[PDB]
């Protein structure tokens, strides 16, 4: 009902009072917040818990594939680059 195609870039951990962190799509990392003020003065970067959570890994890679598909269908030059170099990789490049 807004009539605009969105590009999801982040996946929350929880919804109802359990949203304690986010998972980035372009960077394949998780950001956590455990404090009251400034939530640790920074965000804690432990990328996908070092290849340990299969569900998180699968969701993150599926989100990355969806984002890549969206951006490639939208832009033509990026579509050309995906066509030319990173087709079967599905993991083009970090950032």
């Amino acid at each position: 009902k807004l009539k605009a195609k969105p590009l999801l870039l982040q996946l929350p951990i929880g919804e109802a009072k359990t949203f304690k962190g986010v998972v980035d799509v372009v960077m394949k990392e998780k950001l956590l917040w455990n404090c009251n003020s400034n939530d640790g003065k920074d965000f804690e970067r432990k990328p996908l818990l070092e290849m340990n959570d299969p569900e998180l890994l699968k969701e993150t890679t599926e989100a990355r594939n969806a984002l890549i598909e969206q951006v490639a269908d939208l832009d033509d030059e990026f579509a050309d680059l995906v066509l030319e170099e990173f087709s079967e990789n599905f993991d083009l490049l970090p950032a």
Partner: protein, 70 residues
Amino acid sequence: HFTVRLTEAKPVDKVKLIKEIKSHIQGINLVQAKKLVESLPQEIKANVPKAEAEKIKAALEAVGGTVVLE
């Protein structure tokens, strides 16, 4: 009904062909479309009506594609 065939893909229209294929098939993915476009000669659609075949061939040739009908 008619059948459509993509004969050759132009080196400079490689970028524009894939988007048209994606918008025309409506059921294919990006890498599958790329394999379709790199595996010429290869069929695109079959048992397509005449008007739809004309529209898709016109849209495919306006972006730099070699299209034939059988």
